[PDB]
Amino acid sequence: SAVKAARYGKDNVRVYKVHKDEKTGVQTVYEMTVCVLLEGEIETSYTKADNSVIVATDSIKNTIYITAKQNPVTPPELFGSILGTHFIEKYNHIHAAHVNIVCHRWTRMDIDGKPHPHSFIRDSEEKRNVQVDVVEGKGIDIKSSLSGLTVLKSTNSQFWGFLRDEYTTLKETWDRILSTDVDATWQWKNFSGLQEVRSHVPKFDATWATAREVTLKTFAEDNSASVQATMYKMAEQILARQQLIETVEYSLPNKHYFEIDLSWHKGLQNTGKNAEVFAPQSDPNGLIKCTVGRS
Numbered sequence: 001s002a003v004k005a006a007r008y009g010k011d012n013v014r015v016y017k018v019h020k021d022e023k024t025g026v027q028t029v030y031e032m033t034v035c036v037l038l039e040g041e042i043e044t045s046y047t048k049a050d051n052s053v054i055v056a057t058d059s060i061k062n063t064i065y066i067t068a069k070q071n072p073v074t075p076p077e078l079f080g081s082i083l084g085t086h087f088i089e090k091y092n093h094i095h096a097a098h099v100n101i102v103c104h105r106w107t108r109m110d111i112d113g114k115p116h117p118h119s120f121i122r123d124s125e126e127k128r129n130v131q132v133d134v135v136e137g138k139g140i141d142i143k144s145s146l147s148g149l150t151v152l153k154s155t156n157s158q159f160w161g162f163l164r165d166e167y168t169t170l171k172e173t174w175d176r177i178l179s180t181d182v183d184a185t186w187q188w189k190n191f192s193g194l195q196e197v198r199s200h201v202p203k204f205d206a207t208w209a210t211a212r213e214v215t216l217k218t219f220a221e222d223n224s225a226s227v228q229a230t231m232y233k234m235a236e237q238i239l240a241r242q243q244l245i246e247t248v249e250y251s252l253p254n255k256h257y258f259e260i261d262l263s264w265h266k267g268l269q270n271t272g273k274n275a276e277v278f279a280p281q282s283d284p285n286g287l288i289k290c291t292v293g294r295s
């Protein structure tokens with residue numbers, strides 16, 4: 001037998017960094033969970049117990065903290081690129097570094113309508129993520145995403161005109177609840193290296209903000225014909241706003257809220273136009289995916 005692929009590294013590295021403005025007293029915090037996996041001329045660690053080719057995963061962890069100390073950790077696209085580039089430059093036999101970063105929210109508190117200089121709240125579990133693949137001779141590939149953005153609209157969602165055959169029980173509807181957990185990813189054009197990533201730094205935070213804004217506005221305002229149709233409208237807009245994005249991918253669960261027939265009880269009317277109380281379903285769920293690019 002033979003090694004066809006191999007990668008190894010450190011996962012679940014939690015990192016916090018504080019920036020303290022000396023003039024104003026204002027502090028800013030960042031918290032992220034980092035994973036770094038390396039590839040290269042490492043097959044002999046597997047086949048011959050040759051540990052000489054292993055940069056210990058503990059050292060990978062140390063490098064993450066040292067890198068965070070010596071560089072900005074924001075935007076995450078930049079931090080991941082710096083981190084990945086370190087490994088392929090430092091170690092001759094390491095040829096790719098794969099860096100995943102999950103950014104956790106720490107939003108500044110407003111106390112008596114005034115932003116507090118050093119107190120923060122986790123407003124929701126929505127994440128901002130990056131996957132950075134730094135490959136020797138092939139530049140830097142970056143996928144940016146938002147995930148865990150949970151939304152619901154109580155009307156202005158329809159689902160009718162679908163295929164009906166002997167496997168079909170679903171009733172057509174012209175008014176339903178629509179709720180999802182948004183996972184949205186945008187894939188950047190390949191970057192030639194760290195200098196090119198650095199040259200585009202302002203685009204990263206701006207594009208994340210745009211992607212979030214477009215997602216929420218489209219979801220809120222579309223009179224939705226389906227999850228499919230609404231997600232395509234989102235992707236189309238994001239591509240239109242940032243030419244350095246090559247593709248946009250959505251993965252959306254359709255989290256079902258079922259009507260509850262209560263007419264068996266004192267003729268109570270709770271369906272159709274009288275539907276007020278619903279049973280949220282934990283499972284199963286629809287899962288709808290799409291990748292949209294430029295034609």
Ligand SMILES: O=C(O)c1cccc(C(=O)O)n1
Nearest residue numbers: 161162163164165166168172
């Ligand atoms: O959408 C449908 O319900 C449909 C479509 C073709 C034939 C039939 C039928 O024979 O009932 N029903």
Ligand SMILES: O=C(O)c1cccc(C(=O)O)n1
Nearest residue numbers: 163164165166167168169170
């Ligand atoms: O087999 C079919 O054509 C079918 C299946 C479900 C509903 C209906 C219908 O409402 O006509 N028709």
Ligand SMILES: O=C(O)c1cccc(C(=O)O)n1
Nearest residue numbers: 163164165166167168169170
């Ligand atoms: O027009 C139709 O699609 C139709 C009409 C009567 C019965 C059914 C059915 O059993 O699905 N479908």
Ligand SMILES: O=C(O)c1cccc(C(=O)O)n1
Nearest residue numbers: 198199200201202203204206
């Ligand atoms: O990444 C960018 O979008 C960028 C970088 C440098 C200057 C400018 C600019 O002046 O718009 N924009």
Ligand SMILES: O=C(O)c1cccc(C(=O)O)n1
Nearest residue numbers: 199200201202203206243244
């Ligand atoms: O090359 C650029 O960075 C650029 C070009 C046109 C507009 C903008 C901008 O508004 O940021 N940025």
Ligand SMILES: O=C(O)c1cccc(C(=O)O)n1
Nearest residue numbers: 202203204206207241242243
């Ligand atoms: O700050 C900037 O200059 C900026 C922000 C978002 C997009 C762009 C761009 O596409 O040029 N530029």
Ligand SMILES: O=c1[nH]c(=O)c2nn[nH]c2[nH]1
Nearest residue numbers: 159225226227228254286
């Ligand atoms: O928006 C929807 N898309 C679908 O594909 C689907 N299937 N059942 N309900 C659905 N709702």
Ligand SMILES: [Lu+3]
Nearest residue numbers: 164165166168
């Ligand atoms: Lu029929």
Ligand SMILES: [Lu+3]
Nearest residue numbers: 200202203206
């Ligand atoms: Lu610009």
